[PDB]
Design a protein around this ligand. Structure first.
Ligand SMILES: NC(=O)c1ccc[n+]([C@@H]2O[C@H](COP(=O)([O-])OP(=O)([O-])OC[C@H]3O[C@@H](n4cnc5c(N)[nH+]cnc54)[C@H](O)[C@@H]3O)[C@@H](O)[C@H]2O)c1
Ligand SMILES: NC(=O)c1ccc[n+]([C@@H]2O[C@H](COP(=O)([O-])OP(=O)([O-])OC[C@H]3O[C@@H](n4cnc5c(N)[nH+]cnc54)[C@H](O)[C@@H]3O)[C@@H](O)[C@H]2O)c1
Ligand SMILES: OCc1c(F)c(F)c(F)c(F)c1F
Ligand SMILES: OCc1c(F)c(F)c(F)c(F)c1F
Ligand SMILES: [Zn+2]
Ligand SMILES: [Zn+2]
Ligand SMILES: [Zn+2]
Ligand SMILES: [Zn+2]
Lengths: 374, 374
């Protein structure tokens, strides 16, 4: 039995950038007040985890990464009221404190307690629950799901349906909810509209799913890897285009295809150039473009503000605009009610010990989501 | 007595950038099919007219500028159905053809027949109705209101109330409608919100008017000319700040003042740096920033897309987002019913022949709107 005790378990530690994860024993402290210790069941490999490895995202190292996951509560600290031992849960990489001005705002979800903006790599109290070889190890986004056990703040966990298949619903922890919400909530895609989706990975496919759910008449997938096209069409793309096939810039191609610009465009890659291209390809007077991708740290884009003066709307969002703790249980309930599918996103299922192999599949272009099972 | 005939009249011709207007005789051709010839009554001096002089805004020269005006129809070409001789009218620098995809869209106003994006300086048919010293003179935005008579396409004129005071309602042709609409229609400012308005000229004062009308609790005016602050407070600013007074960048100042960022910001100047500052000062998760100012030709801004990824919305608009021909008569009607005031914008009145003095007043910082009377 483990409650109140330090757990020794296996985790994937990233000691420095641009190296493989190291799978080894860590010590996980018990939860303090208002904290929750979770036995992990499944975690997905999101491109944002790879950004930590590549240096695209800067966060304190060494670190236990991972943010798209599901597990079962092992124990709770004093004062926890929203989960109990035995509950199925999804960690929330965007917290929902319920108290800050963002949480109180009808359209805000980027809770001020987040550890994304100015990452500290800690619990809310500024300390870590992880040690490895006698050294403290940083948390990632208050989640750190690449471990058999993690400790999260109560504001960073949601209880979900006890009958949930955790090996599927872990995707509601990041990639599905992000893409789907980006379409249905952030963009507010309309019936009959034309959409362009740049990047056809797990997140972009989820954007397509949302655009189709919203009733878009045309959904144009854009990727430089044509191997991504078949699955994009399966989940709703009406056409796919590879910028490499064209002599002209793809914004011009997409403007021509849409007879003057698309209604909604989405950048779901993480490149400055495609952010500007995506904005440009939406119709100049009434188009909307949503940035979903995470670009390289500290780099600025260049753009002509006449693109906006004519009437375009440019926005971005974290986690599909969803208030995380309110939304995750409902999304799981909707999944259980067959309102959307997750299997199209899952291309590979590997034991947790094969994390590096899972990352290699992503980097090679061969996978959408690999789910790692503990 | 002049129908079908060439009219010789005085106009303000701009032969060269960075030079005074030349008030001299021009020949104004009669209207062709679907054109309207207008005897001008009053025209305002908008900073965008000055941008033509300074080269901020590139349009073919030589030119008759002017776009904020009101007059009386002198004659109509074949097939005109929406105005008649003797009607009071406002020229529409943003046309409303009623047929293009933008005109048909519920939120679009930047009609595809505009001459703003890629100016040709002609009538819709690609020709000019103006001759001076035997030489063809370009139009500006299909309006060319710095002339005793102009000819406009039917899609570029609106009939207004016969009892309208033209020396006031000319401001509905640009500055008032732009600022007011930017707040009430484009931003959709909410009751109780905090707004920041960069630039306290005629357009920014009109933005303040709209924010107040929408029920904003705080309206922070920002200008480097503190002489602008008294009128900004008269029309609704709750506080004014001069960036030059502060050691820190004004986005940081405004974030502090608003306890974490404003709900709505407006760039109403035309500088790349203030466009980025205005975006930054709105709250990172749910803030909205609207670009109103006209940027220097062909220049790109630089910004970090993380400003958007957190949840900000960035947009721009021409003419306050109003569909021009539908909206201008309604705005005039509302003015007549005292639903908004125009006098706070009018600081100087001059005869048309003193146009250059009117521009001097704008450039010195002394005026908001000078109204020229023909
Ligand atoms: N905003 C959020 O909350 C959020 C959530 C999840 C992921 N992300 C980011 O979203 C992005 C996509 O994540 P993912 O779906 O896991 O990644 P992914 O599975 O690597 O998919 C990216 C796709 O982009 C394609 N691609 C690469 N370069 C180009 C190019 N020049 N043009 C067109 N296509 C190109 C690539 O072939 C691939 O199919 C990443 O930057 C993530 O970090 C953001
Ligand atoms: N989008 C449209 O449809 C539209 C319509 C009308 C005007 N405009 C543009 O809107 C802008 C404002 O026009 P206007 O009100 O007639 O001009 P204006 O009267 O010149 O007002 C601009 C104000 O900006 C102030 N200012 C200048 N530099 C700074 C600075 N660095 N920081 C803070 N304040 C500063 C300046 O002191 C002045 O009071 C111009 O760029 C116009 O071209 C756009
Ligand atoms: O994939 C979700 C995700 C993001 F959207 C980020 F902006 C980020 F910094 C990060 F670490 C992350 F995991
Ligand atoms: O002041 C209105 C106005 C604009 F908003 C422009 F973008 C422009 F190019 C122009 F010529 C103009 F007059
Ligand atoms: Zn919060
Ligand atoms: Zn992710
Ligand atoms: Zn039109
Ligand atoms: Zn103007």
């Amino acid at each position: 039995s483990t409650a109140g005790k330090v757990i020794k378990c296996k985790a994937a530690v990233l000691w420095e950038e641009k190296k493989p994860f190291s799978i080894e024993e860590v010590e996980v402290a018990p939860p303090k007040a208002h904290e929750v210790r979770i036995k992990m069941v499944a975690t997905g490999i999101c491109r944002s985890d790879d950004h930590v490895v590549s240096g695209t995202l800067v966060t304190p190292l060494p670190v236990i990464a991972g943010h798209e996951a599901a597990g079962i509560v092992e124990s709770i600290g004093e004062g926890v009221t929203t989960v109990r031992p035995g509950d199925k849960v999804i960690p929330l990489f965007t917290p929902q404190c319920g108290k800050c001005r963002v949480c109180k705002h009808p359209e805000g979800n980027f809770c001020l307690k987040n550890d994304l903006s100015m990452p500290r790599g800690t619990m809310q109290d500024g300390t870590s629950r992880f040690t490895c070889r006698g050294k403290p190890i940083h948390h990632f986004l208050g989640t750190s799901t690449f471990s058999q056990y993690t400790v999260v703040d109560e504001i960073s966990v949601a209880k979900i349906d006890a009958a949930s298949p955790l090996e599927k619903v872990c995707l509601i922890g990041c990639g599905f909810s992000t893409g789907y919400g980006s379409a249905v909530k952030v963009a507010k895609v309309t019936q009959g509209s034309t959409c362009a989706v740049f990047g056809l990975g797990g997140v972009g496919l989820s954007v397509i799913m949302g655009c189709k759910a919203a009733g878009a008449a045309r959904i144009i997938g854009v990727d430089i890897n044509k191997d991504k096209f078949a699955k994009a069409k399966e989940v709703g793309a009406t056409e796919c285009v590879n910028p490499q096939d064209y002599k002209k810039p793809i914004q011009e191609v997409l403007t021509e295809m849409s007879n003057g610009g698309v209604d909604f465009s989405f950048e779901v890659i993480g490149r400055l150039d495609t952010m500007v291209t995506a904005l440009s390809c939406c119709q100049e007077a009434y188009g909307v473009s949503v940035i979903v991708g995470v670009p390289p740290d500290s780099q600025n884009l260049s753009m002509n503000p006449m693109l906006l003066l004519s009437g375009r709307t440019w926005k971005g969002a974290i986690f599909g605009g969803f208030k995380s703790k309110d939304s995750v249980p409902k999304l799981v309930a909707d999944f259980m009610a067959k309102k959307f599918a997750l299997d199209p996103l899952i291309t590979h299922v590997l034991p947790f010990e094969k994390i590096n192999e899972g990352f290699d599949l992503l980097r090679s272009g061969e996978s959408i989501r690999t789910i790692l099972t503990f």
